[PDB]
């Protein structure tokens, strides 16, 4: 998975992510209403009451709705992404803290926080535990990112020595390794720019580029997390600034198209295909949720505020998994 | 520009291209009917009457429609891509050849040829002339690619020494340098694969990948013509086979997404942005023309056979430069 | 700079390093004898009594003999390499410690310790000071590395958090950034091997590598600290094992030939050229010290055990800076 | 194998090469005197009288001496390098020409030619043939390079379509593919320079290089024919100009250290180690022949003009394959 957040020229904040995985667990956009209540653990029945409503992609087939990403009624946006070989969860809660399943952190944070400071507060009172789940069969190695309505972004990583928190980040996150490693890794590639190198001479040979794009020499094109991070990071820097929210979604999807994995190009050791199942964006100010699927290139939008936020039911919207082609003339 | 041709399990031939440029000329999807008549040169008041009807993206700013790509009523597909520093044209035609403006090649070929052999046979009796056009002010350096209903692709490059013909290519083409150069360059990247490398040990240290995608280490991520040829070539080899026409349109666009350029990340040395204006796809068997725009991610389709192929005028369809978002709710 | 330890088949531990710099400080191979006495600070006359004698490369033109690297009578070797932008020093000594000019660390350590555990313990009671020197005009940002005769290497880093020590490393060290970052960076390159990739097909094309060596696709070839690290680490792993001390030295120099910088290929921001001034090697069990210059590819050896270790004078050998070519038949 | 020529400030022409192979056949430096007689075919008994005397590395196992590289008394210098999967030979001589074994091309040219234009004329009356030889069992795939005293370089390549000659090349050559593929490949790596990239900001982050040598970002480090060509071509352009012959030799061996292959790091698909057996250098004006070996870092020189060039027998020098270490203190 890959993600970033941009800030538009009309002071809107947006967050976007791609979901790469080897299977498609039953998913849909979930609107969770105020006061529905999210569990902390699958084996413990304590349920926290959520103050805020929120919208995002998630699963509704374990006790509480698990969200993969989403936006608040207060503008907090967040996502949980893979963090293989680095995520380490405790076996029993730390003293004075309550246990929490890694899969419920986005739901809980989105339901009760407004700010990145608040997120820092809340996770400080919990202990990510090694509790499994029936949708996967185990507690997945995760790391999380949040961006409030102001634009500030944080990265929370469950490291071996504990919860590591990164503040005022560049607003880019993919998978392992840790955030500090990738941020340092940026320094190796500051030569990657949009501008062409100067033509040089070898003897009497005048050497010139083949076309355009030669300033990018050095950028890796593979789909590892390190290469995905650099491409999102450098294309975030140099892509034109969005002037409004719809441009923001457009530009964000254009940036994530460089890290979009077609089916068949990346296989795991188990021989399974890891591909970009869906791509989504969200705007803090408007609280609109946008998504496109591997099979459908047309963007769909759901508005949080338009629903009844005191509903007693989860409001869900189904994936339209057909290429939504516009026929200009009665096409076969 | 990036382009490739794919074959479905359905026995369908599809061709797709990205249009990368620094300016957007007024372009539309044009249906030119039979016996419409296409010029050879802008200076000569002579038109050649065309036997076949065809659909594609082009311009109507000069005397005859200039098509950038398209499909004819017999299933021949083709496109003109940039070939900077290599395209070489003449001032006067070679004896026994007629002169042709480089910008009219697709229009003339689509209107009168059925097969890749006809293309080769017909281009042989012309000399690409140095005639400028009102739209850009000079004769663009171009190379051409064609794919017929059998799925055979050729490449035509107006080189220094003359027109070079490449029969039976791998169905991939970008920009300079010559096709043969790119085909040889493929051999250096043979180890770019979907599968992950085996873990290795260094002393007492276990070295394992950071996540997935490690098999592709070595592939370039810049937007030079040579890097883009590689990404389209290798992702074409490893993307799952398309089962039918619509899945083929979808896979083509996924492959081409890795060579999609966002506004700003590539600049000419005069500071102009070179981005992907549109992405198009065509099917030889159904004669459907599909496209999506920089600003609109939803695919639009035009059917060539639904129109009156004997019509006396051009049938044109205009661009919808607005993100065609589906509201699942009342979204703002 | 670049360094690496290695272990022979005859149970020997050798160490080697390169010295890359923009200028040549008057240097020679200084032997320092038992109880000679080394300062700690330049603006402070306290001298500690070395109990051991050691050889290495160094300068003499400040109060005590500053050693760049070297071995001793107990088999301890180590080197000081650059660490730009990370190296942080204190202004006054941590209460319980004593100030030491960064440049005297090897001298001090080399004269008094026998093991990597000893070196930690010794360093434990010190506080690297910001005391400049007359040779450069400031205190160089540095990081240190030691290998004992057992074969264990350790990296010592004056980090902003404070001294960071890495025990049992892979025996590779280069410049910035920290040791952990480079060690993590190695996991992204595990596919870089000696073996060739399998041939593949694209359509009808058979694609074979051009010649040998296609297994290393992905390894960078630039002279940055990150790339030199990988090249040395991977080449250290796959280079055949040394059967003896002199086969060890030869192998060490073959590995460092991939990180050897000719004059002029690397320029600093000021305009100075950064090249490999010299390349040294050492054996812990024989205490032999080998080296070659940028202008002399012949290796010169110097034994510590032939010299009178109890002298009260610095036994120094000078550089033969002329290409030592062996004529087989007599001319110029 | 990697090769290059260089001009000094002294007005001298030097040529150097690495010999990369999987076995070391019995090899020695050989002087072949005037009028000695060299065969064309190993099976046919026509010998050609050589007008000139020449030195170089080679073998005496088959009938005439076979030279891998060398310099003649008129300053012509040259070498035969591997051209796997491209070199195509004939079974029968084209009419009007004589058949010549591919392994005798250096000896025949050095013995009878002065100028690069002479070489071209000579070669026009021969037809390279598919005759094997006893040391290998088959005719090795090969391509050739020559530089005369004036410093003009040429590349000769026996391609499927006929003998391809390249005039006034950049004076760099390795293995496959063909010279024009490599020359065009240079244009993709034009941004590889000695200078560092400008620092950048990513939001609040100040992004800066780790150390030096960041301007080389994008240059490969593997030992394939194409990467070796890039490093030699680019390090040749930026390395300081050689002032005299001794600098020339030193400079040539520094450049070739970036393409020097330690044993074990490159394996063939048959498990054989491919490494750099010897590195040689030559000067057209002085006619000195210099070389170093895998196991011997010291340069040995042989002077052609210090011998009786009218001698009736070959004059040969054996490799001293012992590390020639200069003991400075009666070391062990």
Tab-separated table of N, CA and C in Angstrom, chain A residues 194-199 212, chain B residues 267-272:
chain	number	residue	atom	x	y	z
A	194	UNK	N	12.559	17.258	-12.401
A	194	UNK	CA	11.896	17.329	-13.675
A	194	UNK	C	12.747	17.887	-14.806
A	195	UNK	N	13.896	18.503	-14.504
A	195	UNK	CA	14.631	19.211	-15.541
A	195	UNK	C	15.656	18.345	-16.237
A	196	UNK	N	15.907	18.632	-17.505
A	196	UNK	CA	16.839	17.824	-18.265
A	196	UNK	C	18.279	18.165	-17.904
A	197	UNK	N	19.158	17.178	-17.999
A	197	UNK	CA	20.582	17.360	-17.752
A	197	UNK	C	21.164	18.116	-18.941
A	198	UNK	N	22.351	18.705	-18.808
A	198	UNK	CA	22.946	19.407	-19.942
A	198	UNK	C	23.515	18.378	-20.926
A	199	UNK	N	23.409	18.687	-22.207
A	199	UNK	CA	24.054	17.888	-23.221
A	199	UNK	C	25.568	17.958	-23.001
A	212	UNK	N	12.265	13.399	-23.288
A	212	UNK	CA	12.127	14.205	-22.087
A	212	UNK	C	12.180	13.211	-20.934
B	267	UNK	N	9.746	18.436	-17.229
B	267	UNK	CA	9.743	19.740	-17.899
B	267	UNK	C	10.690	19.766	-19.076
B	268	UNK	N	10.322	20.386	-20.187
B	268	UNK	CA	11.309	20.598	-21.253
B	268	UNK	C	12.354	21.555	-20.709
B	269	UNK	N	13.414	21.889	-21.441
B	269	UNK	CA	14.382	22.821	-20.832
B	269	UNK	C	14.043	24.286	-21.031
B	270	UNK	N	12.840	24.553	-21.527
B	270	UNK	CA	12.262	25.868	-21.676
B	270	UNK	C	11.166	25.985	-20.620
B	271	UNK	N	11.067	25.004	-19.741
B	271	UNK	CA	10.124	25.032	-18.652
B	271	UNK	C	8.704	24.595	-18.935
B	272	UNK	N	8.424	24.005	-20.093
B	272	UNK	CA	7.080	23.537	-20.404
B	272	UNK	C	6.830	22.155	-19.830
